[PDB]
Symmetry: C3
Subunit: 145 residues, 3 copies
């Protein structure tokens, strides 16, 4: 997956960003089985005041997670995952749940590329990973926290 | 919905940002019935020159609106909504309509979370809201212009 | 199309951004037949360290391309275009392909607006073009490198 995380500048320190990324990644792996190294968290910071709710300019305490996923998972699983991202980001960012928005979009795995390779269908990550070259496998394994 | 609005840095004053957010939110509310406070406009600013059209570097005048919506509305209504966004953002930002791109993407409401809660299906926002806890309604209600 | 290109601040010089934009635009035009001026490349820069893979903070050498397209093309074609974007961005940005992620999302052309006009279905770009006013055609024609 790629989780785009839209937050205000300086609302998350580097250690908070790290904690948030770990919480989202742990949730994704925990509920889908996808290896840690296949989950990206991409923080997009903007000055406070660039978010409007109902036309009302907001302070710096809002977070929008746009998760981009492969098609093929059940609505039940996606609901569980969205709920866990809400719960665990709330803890990691020390932010009330009312300030968290989470949207999941899905695309065919056949039009999703990670580490320069096309993704497998959900659930087939082990066979896919075993089929990768030694260097590729080693390079991915550097991305596990 | 969440409207990601990609603009150049300093192209929009705070007042023009407020105006553009109001134009989009009013258009969404007017055409869908969804309450003002359920519409987020999220400005993403980048330095002028980061936009290319046909490989040609642009100045700071281009606007791309990526609207993220729940599934369930008609193609007829979605066309009316995108046209109104083009028309009203053009006025609010004082930008010629030719500089405006607008893309709508849709997701099942079951995988969309706002204010920490999953959204209802389109058209059921009234009873959804009435059934939220009193502190959640109060928090939401403030985001109205 | 709109290709959102997420990169670290300072990783691409102005010339490298031009080269990457041209490589993506030339890949899209070459494989879909859509004219150059209908392809936007939109660079989104963030400070290095805002990207995490598997919970691990990354340096400045990662690229995520989010291509937003009309529905209607085959999986085979989308695969070739994703692969060519990987290959040609690798060259243009001087970045190993293992650092490149590319996701394609699709929407109905009927809810996609460019230059203030609704897009036609894939393959019908020629006829769509010469039916716009000459002022709209003239404005688009400049956006060709």
């Amino acid at each position: 997956p790629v989780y785009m995380v839209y937050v205000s500048q300086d609302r998350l320190t580097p250690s908070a960003k790290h904690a948030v990324a770990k919480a989202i990644t742990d949730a994704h792996r925990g509920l889908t089985g996808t290896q840690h190294f296949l989950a990206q968290v991409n923080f997009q910071e903007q000055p406070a005041g660039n978010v409007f709710l109902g036309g009302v300019q907001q302070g710096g305490d809002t977070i929008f997670v746009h998760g981009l996923h492969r098609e093929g998972r059940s609505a039940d699983l996606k609901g569980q995952l969205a709920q866990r991202i809400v719960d665990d980001v709330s803890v990691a960012a020390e932010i009330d749940r009312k300030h968290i928005w989470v949207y999941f979009g899905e695309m065919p795995a056949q039009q999703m590329v990670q580490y320069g390779r096309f993704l497998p269908q959900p659930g087939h990550e082990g066979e896919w990973f075993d089929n990768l070259s030694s260097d590729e496998r080693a390079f991915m394994e550097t991305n596990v926290d």
